[PDB]
Structure 1
């Protein structure tokens, strides 16, 4: 399989791209799809990192911290989108 540094580097770029497009977009449907793209890729890549990474790598550990920061920001944007959906429904 690919190296942990390779997977997390590509995951970082993917999540940054999707989160950027969600913040740029003024369409709630597009925002939900952008956040869904990032959420799915994060779940797959992070859940499989156990298989290829054992720990002890400063770059991989630093990438994990930066990915978690992207993940946390992704969760706020999903909460903001959910807030807007609830407004429409009420």
Structure 2
């Protein structure tokens, strides 16, 4: 059910990224960002196996998810860098 799975993934990532930005400790921020990372890895791996193109609904969600993925990569890197530094 790619459309429902991608809807859930998009909103899951947005929710976790938002909670990361509101977290106090680096540890808590990292947990939310890693949750976004894990869910993206698991769900997009499954999508790649079953979907190559041909749906506007899926394509819109994939573009939205990609933006969240890129934001997550930068936030996660900054968080982990700060954890290592301190």
Q: Same fold (TM over 0.5)?
A: yes
For the aligned residues, what is the CA RMSD?
Answer: 1.1
2:74 aligned partner: 76
SS of the counterpart of 1:14? Answer: helix
- How far off is 1:83 after superposition? 2.4
Equivalent-residue separation in structure 2 for 1:15 and 1:29 (angstroms) = 18
1:38 aligned partner: 36
- How far off is 1:51 after superposition? 3.0
Contact 2:30–2:80 under 8 Å retained in 1: no
The Cα offsets for residues 6-37 of structure 1, whole Å up to 9 and x where unpaired, read as 11000011101100000011211101111111
- How far off is 1:54 after superposition? 3.4
**Structure 1: 5+ residue runs without aligned partners?**
none
Taking structure 1 as the reference length, what is the TM-score of the superposition?
A: 0.88
Q: Point out the more displaced range, 43-52 or 69-78.
A: 43-52
Q: Which has the larger radius of gyration?
A: 1
Taking structure 2 as the reference length, what is the TM-score of the superposition?
A: 0.92
- How far off is 1:50 after superposition? 2.4
